[PDB]
Amino acid sequence: FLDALAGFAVTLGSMFKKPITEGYPEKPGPVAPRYHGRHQLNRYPDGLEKCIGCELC
Amino acid sequence: PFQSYFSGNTVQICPVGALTGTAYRFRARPFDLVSSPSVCEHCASGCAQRTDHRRGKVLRRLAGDEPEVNEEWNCDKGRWAFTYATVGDRITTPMLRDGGVLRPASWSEALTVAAAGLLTAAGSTGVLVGGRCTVEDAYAYAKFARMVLNTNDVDFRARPHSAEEAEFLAAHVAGQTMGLRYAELENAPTVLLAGFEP
Ligand code: SF4
Ligand code: SF4
């Protein structure tokens, strides 16, 4: 039964496919838009800080 | 201006942020306060209090709740007179006198010098205890004087006083605890104030 050798097909086939690795750091992969990265304190359009220091955060 | 000595209580009695303490303003929120029961150290009322401090600095002292002592009230002194320890004049390390100048010294050196000086003083030593010390601290001063310095020269009266006062305190105050209580002042038909301004 060639089925028992199916694995050899998987690895060999994947040899000829383009590697799926993301090219970090030179070509970093795309993080999700909603990703929870660094916190940031934002300003109003006139430049005033938004943070009112309520300490709720 | 609102001139009451108890004005701070109005800040603690307001159910909203209408009345606020200018000192505590924007200093902290409840979650980051370390809050501990306390007793005011200022006068003899001994009010129960709640000391709230943030990052190691006392921000406020609320009235607490002791129905038998102060109920839920303070005077402004107890509520706000807590910054004395952080005005920058605090002694942070033991100090020694050398060449007429007072300079920092290690605890070991300071203890050794003090012990040598006190031993060389034999029984000719006086101990001024002051009124700030707690009961345990006062007991420590008395025990140190009467065991280590072997002297009876202990006096907490850092104020005007008299030998008559010492005799009166020994006869009628010392050992006679809880003879009169706040609950009884509240009910006494007559109260005679002598040399006392409540
Ligand atoms: S929660 Fe309050 S203190 Fe924290 S960032 Fe927002 S406005 Fe500033
Ligand atoms: S809160 Fe005011 S009245 Fe009460 S013990 Fe302190 S100083 Fe005295």
- The first and second tokens of residue A50, run together, are 């938004």
Which of B32, B124, B25, B39 lies closest to B82, judged by CA?
B39
Q: Determine the Cα–Cα distance for residues B83 and B57; give it in Å rounded to an integer.
A: 9
Tokens 């020269």 — which residue?
B153
Nearest CA in chain A to B30: A55
* Sequence-separated (6 or more) residues with CB below 8 Å from residue B146: B152, B154
What's the sign of the alpha-carbon dihedral B158, B163, B164, B166?
A: positive
Neighbour count for residue B197 (Cβ, 10 Å) = 4
Do B32 and A55 lie within an 8 Å CB cutoff? Answer: yes
- Write the Ramachandran bin of B71: left for phi over 0, alpha for psi from -120 to 50, otherwise beta: left
- The first and second tokens of residue B152, run together, are 């009876």
Tokens 């040399």 — which residue?
B195
CB-defined site of ligand 1, < 6 Å: A 51-57
Kindly state whether A53 is in contact with chain B, defined as any CB-CB distance less than 8 angstroms: yes
Beta pairing, strands B57-62 & B48-54: antiparallel
Beta pairing, strands B101-104 & B95-98: antiparallel
Give the containing element (helix H, strand E) for B8. Answer: helix B7-13
Q: Determine the Cα–Cα distance for residues B71 and B143; give it in Å rounded to an integer.
A: 35
Kindly state whether B26 is in contact with chain A, defined as any CB-CB distance less than 8 angstroms: yes
Give the containing element (helix H, strand E) for B60. Answer: strand B57-62
What's the sign of the alpha-carbon dihedral A6, A11, A13, A17?
A: positive
* Amino acid occupying residue A37: G
Residue B133 annotated in ligand binding: no
Q: Determine the Cα–Cα distance for residues B7 and B21; give it in Å rounded to an integer.
A: 10
Q: How many CA atoms lie within 13 A of B99 on its CB side?
A: 1
Kindly state whether A46 is in contact with chain B, defined as any CB-CB distance less than 8 angstroms: no
Residues in a beta bridge with A49: A43
Q: Determine the Cα–Cα distance for residues B34 and B50; give it in Å rounded to an integer.
A: 10
Q: How far is B135 from chain A (nearest CA, A)?
A: 40
- The first and second tokens of residue A49, run together, are 């800080």
Mutate to test the interface with A, among B24, B29, B32, B54 (most CBs of A within 10 A): B29
Residue B193: helix, strand or coil by DSSP?
coil
Tell me the backbone φ, ψ of residue B35, rounded to 5 degrees.
-120, 130
Residues B110-129: b if buried by 16+ CB within 10 A, e if exposed:
eeeeeeeeeeeeeeeeebeb
